[PDB]
């Protein structure tokens, strides 16, 4: 459970992400795929994107990063009260896409890397700690939902 102060820091840096959702999504995906290359295999339509310029130029990929960050932003703004927003995401991700909790941690690492890289002055220790706690709560709750649906994380 997060403090109101913690939620404030999460939402303060989230407002900065929202000045450029699409560029943050690109950087996050580029980082994720480079760091943890197994993750690119869940994206069949992005396989031919073999260099960083090719990744940046893909409207497909760009749009997908806005779709993911939009859903994550809406979850964050509910400050933990996110069952209604979380349930459809667990359903597609447990049953259709097959995304293990470990991959959610990898992308959580990429989000934190990119928010440090772009907003170091608004992403010091206590802000990083809050964002980590928020992402941890997201992943705890999505994993409980995965198990309800019969998917083992
Ligand atoms: C933060 C975190 C996150 C978020 C919020 C998200 C969100 C999302 C959204 C909103 C969508 C659309 C709808 C549905 O459900 O389907 C998606 C999809 C999606 N998803 Zn995901 N995700 C994520 C992570 C992820 C990862 C990590 C992966 C891998 C690796 C993924 C993979 C995915 C896919 C594959 C899809 C489909 C796409 C297409 O196909 O178009 N995912 N996703």
Bound molecules: protoporphyrin IX containing ZN
Structural class: mainly alpha
Number of domains: 1
Q: Provide the gyration radius in Å.
A: 15 Å
CATH architecture: Orthogonal Bundle
What is the string of SSEs from the N terminus onward? HHHHHHH
Shape category: globular
Determine the strand fraction and express it as a percent band: under 5%
Count of DSSP H/I helices: 7
CATH class: Mainly Alpha
Which topology does CATH recognise?
Answer: Globin-like
Say which CATH homologous superfamily is assigned. Globins
InterPro entries: Globin, Globin-like_sf, Myoglobin
Domain Globin: 1-147
Catalytic activity: Fe(III)-heme b-[protein] + nitric oxide + H2O = Fe(II)-heme b-[protein] + nitrite + 2 H(+); H2O2 + AH2 = A + 2 H2O
Binding site for nitrite: 64
Any overview of this molecule?
- There is one protein chain.
- By secondary structure, this protein is mainly α.
- It has one domain (1-153): Orthogonal Bundle (Globin-like).
- The chain is 72% helix and 0% strand.
- The protein contains seven helices and no strands.
- Helix 1 crosses helix 7 and helix 2 packs across helix 6 (101-118).
- The chain is globular, with a radius of gyration of 15 Å.
- The two termini are 21 Å apart.
- It binds protoporphyrin IX containing ZN (ZNH).
- Protoporphyrin IX containing ZN binds next to helix 4, helix 5 and helix 6.
- Its EC number is 1.7.-.-, 1.11.1.-.
- Pfam families: Globin.
- One of its GO terms (molecular function) is nitrite reductase activity.
- Nitrite binds at residue 64.
- O2 binds at residue 64.
């Amino acid at each position: 459970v997060l403090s109101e102060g913690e939620w404030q820091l999460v939402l303060h840096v989230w407002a900065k992400v929202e000045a450029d959702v699409a560029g943050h999504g690109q950087d996050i995906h580029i980082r994720l795929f480079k760091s943890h290359p197994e993750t690119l295999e869940k994206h069949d339509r992005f396989k031919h994107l073999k260099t960083e310029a090719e990744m940046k130029a893909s409207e497909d990929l760009k749009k997908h990063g806005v779709t993911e960050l939009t859903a994550l932003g809406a979850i964050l703004k509910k400050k933990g009260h996110h069952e209604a927003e979380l349930k459809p995401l667990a359903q597609s991700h447990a049953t259709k896409h097959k995304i293990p909790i470990k991959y959610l941690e990898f992308i959580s690492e990429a989000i934190i890397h990119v928010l440090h890289s772009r907003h170091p002055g608004d992403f010091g220790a206590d802000a990083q700690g809050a964002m980590n706690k928020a992402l941890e709560l997201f992943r705890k709750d999505i994993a409980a939902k995965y198990k309800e649906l019969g998917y083992q994380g």
